[PDB]
């Protein structure tokens, strides 16, 4: 299909090549381009606790990215202290 296409009059409607605004969160995977054609073509953020691979109930405040449940266990070492 590399030697085919649509009408020119329709091509004017092509989506603006301006890069998409829906990226994927990387806490720290090199951004690089059969089943490969659509293994995970759908693009969406996948923010998740950097401890447990769980995408539910994650704090993004201050750039933590820690599950609320897994927060209590490590809070003591992380520095947070329970007073007042």
């Amino acid at each position: 299909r590399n030697l085919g296409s649509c009408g020119a009059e329709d091509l004017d409607s092509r989506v603006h090549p301006s890069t998409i605004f829906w990226p994927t969160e990387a806490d720290n995977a090199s951004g690089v381009p059969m089943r490969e054609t659509e293994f995970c073509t759908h693009i969406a953020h996948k923010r998740e606790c950097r401890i447990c691979g769980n995408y539910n109930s994650v704090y993004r405040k201050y750039g933590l990215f820690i599950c609320r449940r897994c927060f209590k266990e490590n809070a003591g070492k992380i520095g947070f202290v329970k007073l007042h």
Binding site: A29, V32, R50
Partner: protein
């Protein structure tokens, strides 16, 4: 699955030189920022996560290295059997020794 030989050799060399692979738990599309390879590409091209993950699994299952997982990062370490096997695939001689033995 059809993993290139250049990737095999690159990973082996990186392992022996560093004695340590610090890998991330991933299974989607994406290349590794560390190890690298060149196949008439003009610029060293990095490997894909699926390839290296399968290679690491095979190696560890064969008893060449051991691992810890911590959280979100497979840490690997090659055993004596490791040094005794990579040197063969890199086609090395017993005299050579991993870098870390040389005052890190």
């Amino acid at each position: 699955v059809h993993i290139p030989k250049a990737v095999y050799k690159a990973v082996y060399a990186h392992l022996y030189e560093n004695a340590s692979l610090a890998l991330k738990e991933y299974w989607r599309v994406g290349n590794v920022p560390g190890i690298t390879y060149v196949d008439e590409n003009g610029k060293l091209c990095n490997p894909t996560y699926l390839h290296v993950n399968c290679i690491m699994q095979s190696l560890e299952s064969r008893g060449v290295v051991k691992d810890t997982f911590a959280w979100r990062h497979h840490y690997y370490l090659l055993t004596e059997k490791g040094e005794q096997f990579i040197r063969k695939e890199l086609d090395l001689t017993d005299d050579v020794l991993p870098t870390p033995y040389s005052k890190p």
